[PDB]
Design a protein around this ligand. Sequence first.
Ligand SMILES: [Zn+2]
Ligand SMILES: [Zn+2]
Ligand SMILES: [Zn+2]
Lengths: 53, 53, 53
Amino acid sequence: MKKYTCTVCGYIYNPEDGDPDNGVNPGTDFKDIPDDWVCPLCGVGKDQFEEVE
Amino acid sequence: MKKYTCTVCGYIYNPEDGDPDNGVNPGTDFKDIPDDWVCPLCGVGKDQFEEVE
Amino acid sequence: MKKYTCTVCGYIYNPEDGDPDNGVNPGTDFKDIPDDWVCPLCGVGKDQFEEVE
Ligand SMILES: [Zn+2]
Ligand SMILES: [Zn+2]
Ligand SMILES: [Zn+2]
């Protein structure tokens, strides 16, 4: 599974770690994160994220 | 996947569109929507919805 | 699927019933409950739960 980066602040979503404190369990692919989730550091929406190739 | 209608207000849940602003991604079957979700237009619970055959 | 117990208060999570009022549908294995969920009776985190063997 691929990492994704917040293109506003630089935060990296790592699927192995998830974002458990906001309800995103380890092993969740980015696409499957609920679409109302926001960057945990800066607060912007998922549409500001991009895949890290 | 089937559409579902709110039998109180008439809203249509379309699985191809989801309800992303409330965390329901495109491609989510109605049954798999978390059971605390409510109609985005009128606020009633899932138990007021019915399958559109 | 296994039941899990809150080791603080004694609540039992039964996967057949879920916890629908908090968005956990029937049939959800404990591991797949979002990791920000808390015991519905006492409020402690998932890390205070244990599998009932
Ligand atoms: Zn950010
Ligand atoms: Zn409605
Ligand atoms: Zn408890």
